[PDB]
Symmetry: D3
Subunit: 232 residues, 6 copies
């Protein structure tokens, strides 16, 4: 029974959006699981097998309990019954309290396409008559949040990651093939100082909240607050 | 040093919007102060002196520490330097961590006009060179929230008031002149089952959050969450 | 030639959203038809054959002229040419002046997925070269409205159902398997005082309009008003 | 007791926004009153005394029952207690069922400033303890609508003016000083084919509604529909 | 290497939305290419072979360099991997600096469905490991804009077409089967003075910008301005 | 006749929002004028006379033609006829093609209050019968833009300041009293690494546009584009 299951379309998605928060939860001794929907086979730099090892190292840096690999097609995350059913299996295995996924307002259509699949799977996961591949039992996720990969939007709320900013940067630097030019690298939006741009965003969200660094999140579900109203 | 200072234009505003939350905070042994900007001299039912006693009884039912009465004019809450300065004095006296005020989307223009004054006063309160009537020192409010009086909008978040719904209803029933027809009452939107309409709204916000009753709030300032992300 | 064709994903959708309005139109001697897109085979409580009989009784209580059953899959309302074509047949059979369907902002993705299919079918229905299963002639729907099932949003307009609130509640209570716990019932959002929550919403929309109860609707198409501008 | 009281900042405002609708209501034997808040003393073309006669002729063309002239300052429609009180007098004299005023999204700030004053006056008009200049009794307006002068926005609804488009154009052509260049005219946005631009807008709103010409309106208050839902 | 590739679902889409702009760019000696995604086989008036000749003549009037015909199904522009791949081929052939496509807020669902396909294809076109039908090389489009067919919305910006309004009207009048009733014509929204409605819209957008005629556009991508900030 | 007149509430406002753009325009040999509405007498750090000298040095670093000082009260920018008239004088003196002012979505209410005054003054400036203090002639501003001081919002467009980022940072560092702690400094939001936060924002807007640094702007007026559509 995971506290947190974080979905990305591609390994590095979850780290860019919420690596600071993952590291924060692990230090609170929460069980955090990461699921990549695809093997990122169409990424311009690296290979599928190199990418899997970079992703395994990023998960170890943050202290994620397990890294789950689905094999939905890169640039093929079209709404389908079969794609939803595979994701329902992952939710019903992990039984998470909270699911995180990418925010759909993003230059990469896979990020929005992934969110649409995960939303369908969250609902289907809670229906006992809906049968998944492994015929597992219904599970109702309590909290559903959206993190930002490429976007800089005004978030619904932020989480202070002032104490895990270095761990986030280490988890991103594990993806050498994506962010660090090599002899055989091609220029992408990721090879042009991308990690410093993510730091800049987390710095601006920090400012709105009066801390050094924060990650932004959206919720479609109603937020219910208690301790965080007065924060005392 | 109050935990909470809740502003209304008229006594009964704070009770309608957040009486459940006030009662909840008092039971957590928070210091809660209420300030009415006007004496509600233009209210169709009752009188200024009757209204003050109803308001004092409503505050006792919820356990509010003190009830502060300003004398800005009913239906005269026009943006003015003098009106802002009087409100700055109240903020600098109470030194609250959190300020609540009415949400501006409301059929009663005084609710929006009150919010505009309180927003100006929150900013001016934190400027040491800004001199108030009693020449008090700068105070920076940490949290600023908006409660709903007449509106039913989708809120930024809710607070569970399942355990203080009865105390809220008692604080509202203290305003007999406003909600209960008498021999000499005139028909207003308030004399036509208004308390049951407030209960209905708190019931629907409860449903979105999976509890019996909740009050809705807005924040213009960025929300920073911690314990309430996973709620464990 | 129906005055009204109301689509739901599942039987009970149309009753929750607009049962009061259906009853109102029938009493005005309008011809009202209801179409359920699925047999609701994945509903946690009841069975397909029990659900069909509950739905037939709900239609009789409101006085709907006919209840049409399609067999699109529950939790399988993916955008497809074949699903649109089956719905085009229903529109071209009933030749309705006004079509109602669910509002897409709803925790149940089937409600939004149903609306997307019905919107495509409304457009295709009016193209004579578009051939449906029964090769029927083009029909142009005049009015297209959206009703709310799970949501409480600010609607584009409301309809007074003060005189049909009891008929609505009777049509909902016909779905015993959905709303009334039994020995063999599982807990769902519907088995936990759901009908009283629908009444609460219709009560709050009533208040905005100055009546006891009203149902809320959206229109994407431009509203053209005449008698209702002054209502005299 | 007027059916309709239409406020403008300047004479010609009401005609540009809703001259077609005024003519339509008069033909339905509704009592329509027009109030100009200012004498338009800062208009670049014409004079105050010429403008009053053009306005009187425009009112006769549409068949408005009476034309009421206030003397609030042109480009001086700042929120003030005194300006609101003068407008409350006009509402309490006319006792209108419906009030129309300019939509605030308009290049001319007086249009938005007028709407803000009229909104305050509508609320104060319904409070019996609020005393106006002539100490008249409380009146509650039922319907409150906003018409467009300079803007082309997506309206909440439209009214078919196909049968009163010529009467509207005649009422606008009565303002010769505003729309028709003379020897002593200066170039303004109004002297450069403005009437044909208003016709173009009413033609596009017609198209959305499937008629020749329509005027667009907004409502902040909830719309309650009945006959206009099916329009039969 | 085209300066401009303009996508429509149906021939006449690009002309309605941006015929004035196409004519303007051609006169600036830009290379402009037009791609129709479908043969418009379900259009109520005309035939596929007549429509192709009307489209070829419209392209000659505007001076478009080439007109590209895909054969995706009319009313069958469902999101699919195969439909995206065919559009990727067109982008990789033309290597355009700027892509235009329909704005999704439109009574015709094909316009929105076309935009969704073209957006996916723009992203996939720039991925070298994504293989199209003709295995062409990656191309990154710089500018992506949306034009309006049936809608009248507030655009992100306009382009002055005062000097190409007549060329636009000629390109539209080449579609005789669509806009001009014949002995064998059926009534559609297009056969009822549609070209004059497009002129009216371009006239109103002109007014906002202080010119005779302008076409409106949206951009999801950030606009970067330079010369057009001061326009000197 | 200025190309650009940039209004701030306080000296440093224009530099924070658009110092890069000011420096860019001056290098294009545009005439740029800056007007501060107040002397910033309530600023927590420094004095009025020190602030004026810092402001004069910031203007020299950017190469602004003249720096105009009004004496409206700090935290007293209430809508008034007298405040508007003083600003009309500045517009009619400078006869600018483009006016810049603060965006109203900002934690400092003076920024929004300044924008409201400048908007009223832009309109009144173009009315010849509106008499300013120095009875100057009507001037119609062509372009009106809004820059961001404290906010990080999604802008309508950006301007590349990659080549003037160092000049902007120098103009900000001229305000030593505001940004650099001294023996007698008090902690404010400005004394806590504020210049690096402005650089971070300009870096993120750069990324959206594919350059190193950009400043974001809003326009209420319609944007008309020409060269910047294709940027060739
Ligand atoms: Na939410
Ligand atoms: Na917020
Ligand atoms: Na609509
Ligand atoms: Na409304
Ligand atoms: Na954009
Ligand atoms: Na604009
Ligand atoms: Zn990704
Ligand atoms: Zn009140
Ligand atoms: Zn349903
Ligand atoms: Zn006017
Ligand atoms: Zn088309
Ligand atoms: Zn400032």
């Amino acid at each position: 029974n995971a506290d947190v299951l974080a979905f990305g379309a591609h390994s590095d998605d979850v780290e860019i959006g919420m690596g600071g928060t993952i590291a924060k939860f692990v230090k609170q001794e929460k069980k955090v699981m990461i699921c990549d929907l695809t093997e990122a086979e169409l990424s311009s730099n690296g290979t599928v097998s190199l990418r899997k090892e970079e992703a395994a190292e990023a998960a170890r840096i943050l202290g994620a309990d397990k890294r789950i690999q689905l094999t939905l097609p890169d640039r093929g995350l079209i709404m389908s019954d079969q794609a939803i059913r595979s994701i329902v299996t992952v939710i019903r295995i992990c039984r998470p309290k909270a699911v995180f996924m990418p925010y759909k307002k993003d230059r990469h259509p896979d990020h929005g396409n992934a969110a649409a699949l995960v939303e369908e799977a969250i609902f289907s996961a809670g229906i006992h008559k809906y049968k998944d591949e492994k015929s597992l039992p219904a599970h109702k996720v309590s909290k559903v949040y959206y993190y930002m990969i490429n976007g800089f939007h005004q978030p619904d709320f932020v989480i202070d990651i002032s104490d895990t900013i270095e761990a986030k940067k280490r988890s991103l630097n594990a993806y050498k093939s994506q962010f660090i030019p090599s002899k055989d690298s091609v220029s992408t939006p990721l090879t042009n100082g991308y990690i410093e741009i993510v730091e800049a965003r987390e710095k601006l969200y920090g400012k709105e909240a009066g801390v050094e660094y924060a990650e932004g999140f959206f919720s479609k579900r109603m937020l219910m607050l208690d301790h965080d109203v007065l924060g005392g």
